[PDB]
Amino acid sequence: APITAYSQQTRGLLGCIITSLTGRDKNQVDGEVQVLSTATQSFLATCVNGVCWTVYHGAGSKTLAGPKGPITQMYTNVDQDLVGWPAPPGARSMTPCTCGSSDLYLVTRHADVIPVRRRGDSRGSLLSPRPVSYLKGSSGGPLLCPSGHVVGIFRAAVCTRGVAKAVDFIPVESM
Amino acid sequence: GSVVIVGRIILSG
Ligand SMILES: O=C(N[C@H]1CCCCCCC[C@@H]2C[C@@]2(C(=O)NS(=O)(=O)C2CC2)NC(=O)[C@@H]2C[C@@H](OC(=O)N3CCc4ccccc4C3)CN2C1=O)OC1CCCC1
Ligand SMILES: [Zn+2]
Numbered sequence: 231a232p233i234t235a236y237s238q239q240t241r242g243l244l245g246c247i248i249t250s251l252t253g254r255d256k257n258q259v260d261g262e263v264q265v266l267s268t269a270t271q272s273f274l275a276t277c278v279n280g281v282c283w284t285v286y287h288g289a290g291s292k293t294l295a296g297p298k299g300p301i302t303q304m305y306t307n308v309d310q311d312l313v314g315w316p317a318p319p320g321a322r323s324m325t326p327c328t329c330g331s332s333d334l335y336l337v338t339r340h341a342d343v344i345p346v347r348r349r350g351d352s353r354g355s356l357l358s359p360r361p362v363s364y365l366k367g368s369s370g371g372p373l374l375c376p377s378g379h380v381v382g383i384f385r386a387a388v389c390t391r392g393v394a395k396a397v398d399f400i401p402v403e404s405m
Numbered sequence: 406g407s408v409v410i411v412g413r414i415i416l417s418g
Contacts, residue, residue: 232418239412250406257410265412272411284408295407318410337414371414378418 231333231376235341237265253293253300258318263337263372268292274339274370276383277321281305281314283383283405284370289313305405311385312400324372326402327379334375336397337386339367346373346397348381353388355396362387365394373399 240257241249247269266276266284273288282294286308293300294315298342305314317323332348346354354373371384380402388396 234417236415237412238415241409242410246409246411249409253407255410259410259413261413261415263414263416265414266408266412267411268408269406274414275410289408293407295409300407312410337416339414341414374416378416 231335231378233335233343233374235263235337235343237339237341239265239381243269244339245287247401248285249295250380253295255297258329259318262322264321265339272367274384276370276372276380277317277323278326278380278402278405279323280317281356281405282317282321283312283314285383285385286311286313288369298396310400310404312404314399314405324380327377327381329375329376331375331377334373334381336368336373338365338373339371342366349396351401352382352385352398353396354399356394360394362389362392362394373397
């Protein structure tokens with residue numbers, strides 16, 4: 231699967247503190263994966279079927295800054311560590327996976343696409359182990375099948391003595 | 406405060 235990724239920053243920190251306080255986003259949203267930030271931590275979101283989905287341990291119950299004001303969380307499932315907002319116009323939704331393939335590809339905030347082997351509903355193993363510091367801030371990022379459809383979003387790193395060896399994720403069916 | 410879209414990840418292939 232020749233899946234690649236490229237990260238584009240659309241905002242600085244000053245513009246982030248300001249847009250955070252107001253709740254009003256002037257910018258035009260594009261893409262399927264969004265890079266999110268509260269002023270103090272940064273993580274990912276994936277738009278699937280109308281909703282911008284991310285992790286609770288990242289977003290909390292916070293509103294998302296939108297074109298015409300703060301967008302309230304329509305969906306919150308603390309049991310699953312999942313939140314969603316209705317996607318702002320411009321944010322294209324990804325197509326949920328069909329092939330039921332077990333060969334997955336995790337997209338990180340650093341625009342890398344990591345091969346992952348599915349082990350259960352919520353579990354896949356990293357074919358190559360990764361440093362913990364390398365994966366931090368990538369929760370909410372999608373796991374894609376070889377054709378390129380969403381099977382879930384990254385939730386937690388499964389570690390073996392300080393090094394990530396597997397990923398735990400929220401399946402698409404859960405959303 | 407709100408959560409803010411500060412960037413995006415463009416996918417390909
Ligand atoms: O607890 C962990 N592992 C920790 C390891 C922490 C070290 C940092 C690893 C790095 C990468 C990892 C994706 C990530 C992250 O980047 N978060 S972030 O920086 O974007 C943050 C938003 C700003 N999530 C994490 O850091 C999670 C958060 C915390 O776990 C949760 O809050 N979970 C644990 C998973 C889970 C599963 C079911 C229901 C609720 C929950 C809630 C520990 N974590 C973890 O991932 O693994 C358990 C749970 C699943 C299998 C065993
Ligand atoms: Zn598929």
